[PDB]
């Protein structure tokens, strides 16, 4: 009975930025879902296409956990069939998505008096991101006709934008840690399954 490393994903000292979200593939372990839905720590728990109680019985070939820190307003954006700047250019969720998105407030952990500007999001991108696609390239965005030529200038802007993340910031602006669980049964063998 080797439990799946859920605690490592959820209780992680460092979480990746929105633009370069961190994906961890979990398999070949007895996943315990009871702890996730029996804990009141998580501010927001949404499950699409799956039921948390039913998760224990169900067997999945692979589980993908996506970790990123976003603003409170942006939490709404990351959902199937939802349009937002974060959804369009940072992290995209398929409309036909089976899994649970879990968000909890991390204001104390990720806010400092000066402000935590390490976290970044892609303000500008040429096209909307396809589902489950990560763009990490840092290239100056061109908006005007004139070519940027790799140099910051008028009508040319660096894509990444810092997050203020002050401690006194309002709940909407407070940092929120979000873990997105994706359940895939496409592979023929089933490994993770649940607790028995």
């Amino acid at each position, epitope marked *: 009975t080797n439990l799946c490393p859920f605690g490592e994903v959820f209780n992680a000292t460092r979480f990746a930025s929105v633009y370069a979200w961190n994906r961890k593939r979990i398999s070949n372990c007895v996943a315990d879902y009871s702890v996730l839905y029996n804990s009141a720590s998580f501010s*927001t*728990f*949404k*499950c*699409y296409g799956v*039921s948390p109680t039913k998760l224990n019985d169900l067997c999945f070939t692979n589980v993908y956990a996506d970790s990123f820190v976003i603003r*409170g307003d942006e*939490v709404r954006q990351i959902a*199937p069939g939802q349009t937002g700047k974060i959804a369009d250019y940072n992290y995209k969720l398929p409309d036909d998505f089976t899994g649970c998105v879990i968000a909890w407030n991390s204001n104390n952990l990720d806010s400092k008096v000066g402000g935590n500007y390490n976290y970044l999001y892609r303000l500008f991108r040429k096209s909307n991101l396809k589902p489950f696609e990560r763009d990490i390239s840092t290239e100056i965005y061109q908006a005007g006709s004139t070519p940027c030529n790799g140099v910051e200038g008028f009508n040319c802007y660096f894509p990444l934008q810092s997050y203020g993340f002050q401690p006194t910031n309002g709940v909407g602006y407070q940092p929120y840690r979000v873990v997105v669980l994706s359940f895939e049964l496409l592979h023929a063998p089933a490994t993770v399954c649940g607790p028995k």
Partner: nanobody, 130 residues
Framework: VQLVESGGGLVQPGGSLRLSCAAS????????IGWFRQAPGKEREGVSF????????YYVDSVKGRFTISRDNAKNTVYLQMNSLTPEDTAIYYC????????????????????????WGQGTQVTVSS
């Protein structure tokens, strides 16, 4: 979609009060209803939610046990029953229509953030003062 809130008023500490949110223009069962509490000068905070269409409910630790949320399909009204009220519970209370379970793929939906919920209703002030 129109939401009408009923109940509220001055209550003694430890009093029991029932808040009813009227629902019109939509089916109450399909949507996920979350009650929200707004303190003066503070963002709205979710207290009780209808997590699933089956009627499963989640209560925040602060309001757990004391607050019970019930849904009546026949009257198309969702009732929040508050017991053992305390002065710290003096705030404006809101009901949120939320996303429809049938339209989306959601089976369990709960959020403590106001932006997540699709629709809002006018607030009703509840005051508990010794």
């Amino acid at each position: 979609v129109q939401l009408v809130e009923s109940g509220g008023g001055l209550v003694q500490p430890g009093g029991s009060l029932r808040l009813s949110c009227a629902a019109s223009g939509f089916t109450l069962d399909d949507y996920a209803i979350g009650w929200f509490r707004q303190a003066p000068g503070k963002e709205r905070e979710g207290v009780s939610f209808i997590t699933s269409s089956d009627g499963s409910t989640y209560y925040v630790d602060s309001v757990k046990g004391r607050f019970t949320i019930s849904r009546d399909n026949a009257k198309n009204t969702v009732y929040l029953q508050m017991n053992s009220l305390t002065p710290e519970d003096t705030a404006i209370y809101y009901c949120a229509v939320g996303p429809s379970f049938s339209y989306t793929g959601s089976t369990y939906y709960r959020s403590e953030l106001p932006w997540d919920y699709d629709y809002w209703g006018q607030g009703t002030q509840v005051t508990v003062s010794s």
